[PDB]
């Protein structure tokens, strides 16, 4: 369970020109280490992958959002759903206890505390 995870496949000779996808990152890695190695930096790297991460996660989701689907209105089945249900538990509670507290007794007589 989670997952198989399909760690093996076929090759020879599927997509011969697909290689050098590391050329995207090794150019950045050359741009990384040249920024990393210097006689005076005294500070953190800008690292815009984390800049584009949180700000496009914490913010810019409500400008993305529209209620054009009911699977966006699907949160009614999770927020207000059990919130009625706990009161549906609790409204049945506290009154059945009260009727046995009003009519008849069940408690011990030394219940000062409470």
């Amino acid at each position: 369970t989670t997952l198989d995870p399909a760690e093996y496949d076929i090759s020879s000779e599927t997509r011969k020109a697909q290689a050098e996808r590391l050329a995207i990152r090794s150019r950045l890695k050359r741009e990384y280490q040249l920024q990393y190695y210097d006689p005076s930096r005294r500070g953190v790297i800008e690292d815009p992958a984390l800049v584009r991460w949180t700000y496009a996660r914490s913010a810019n989701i409500y400008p993305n959002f529209r209620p054009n689907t009911k699977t966006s209105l699907l949160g009614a089945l999770f927020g207000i759903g059990p919130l009625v249900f706990w009161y549906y538990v609790f409204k049945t509670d506290r009154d059945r206890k009260e009727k046995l507290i009003q009519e008849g007794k069940l408690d011990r007589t030394f219940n000062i505390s409470y």
């Binding site: 005076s40 953190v44 913010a59 059990p82 919130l83 609790f90 509670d93 206890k97």
Partner: protein, 458 residues
Amino acid sequence: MLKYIIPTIMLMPLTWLSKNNMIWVNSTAHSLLISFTSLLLMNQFGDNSLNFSLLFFSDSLSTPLLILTMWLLPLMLMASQHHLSKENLTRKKLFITMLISLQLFLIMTFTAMELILFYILFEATLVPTLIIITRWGNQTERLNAGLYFLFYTLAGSLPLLVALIYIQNTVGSLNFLMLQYWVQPVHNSWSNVFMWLACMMAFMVKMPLYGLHLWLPKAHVEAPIAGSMVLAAVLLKLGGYGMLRITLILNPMTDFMAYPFIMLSLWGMIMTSSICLRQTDLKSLIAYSSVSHMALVIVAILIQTPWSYMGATALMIAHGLTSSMLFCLANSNYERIHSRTMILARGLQTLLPLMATWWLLASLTNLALPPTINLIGELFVVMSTFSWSNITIILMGVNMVITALYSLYMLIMTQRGKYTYHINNISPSFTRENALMSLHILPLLLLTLNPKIILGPL
């Protein structure tokens, strides 16, 4: 307060009157001298009650609450000097005066003797705190958060004037809480429901609920320089104690509609704790913790019948020291790494071993180590609502289990390796960084020696 507001207003014609950089050492020096005068004339006995002098003070008899109000001003000036010293001297001194002016209204508040002087002092704040968010804050999206900092508290508080003057012209006069001996009962109607509604709903604006609380992770997220007024915003949220003043009387018997305030603050309690285990901000990390076990106290009050007033007296000051101390941890580790995002802080615990003890004991106040001031009151919330019913221990106990992970979720983030970066962040925790980090647990466990003063009437 005979002369408590009187010495501290004289501190105000001393900032711009003074010399150059002497203004920091002078302002801290006078400030601690008032702290003994607070301790001396208060803490007297004590049996119902100490009506203090006259129509302006009832001496905070049932709940002292006022010692904590006076630590912070000789505690944040040493904190705000981290990143403030870049401006003109006349502009920096104005930033000193507005924080001192914040204390003076709150010095008269929490005692207040009355209700018509309460609301004008209940609204006497929000003027200096708003200006702190506008000028000398952080990066943008400040101004909408300044507007969300308004337009909620002011939106809910205006029916109090609809409520209170409707009481003043009807039955006697609300100048005296102690002339509230004759109180007529309140029956179920369609007019009296709203009478209780406006009496209560404004107090839910400050201590939050699962509703209407989106503004709270804006002022703490977009915040001033290094937790400067954020420490004052801790007392601003807990300082909604006035429900203890009001609903103790003045329609007590309406509990038929108590239930949707019991339930909403209960499933919202367990929810907002887990709403931050995937948060990516440090100043938002303590903020959602500060919702949960601050929402614990509300069901301790609307449920009446003491053994609930006992712990709720102590649970206001519980995170009030703790979350103030956590913000002091978060105000640090930002002058050295100029982004507040927690993930970038891999590879700590080796460069700063001295403050690593302070991370341990601080987060050991959320697990809270039952001989402290935290789990001495949470056991009484257990002691109350279990007499309500047998179900209430379930959702309230998991709150003690989620924050067990949620506190140690922060501690383990300090322990990593090789740190990848950081030719900056050299500074091995200077004197201001650790002396200000003290004086939080140093009175806290001190109060755990004889915790007799932290008790209501009750």
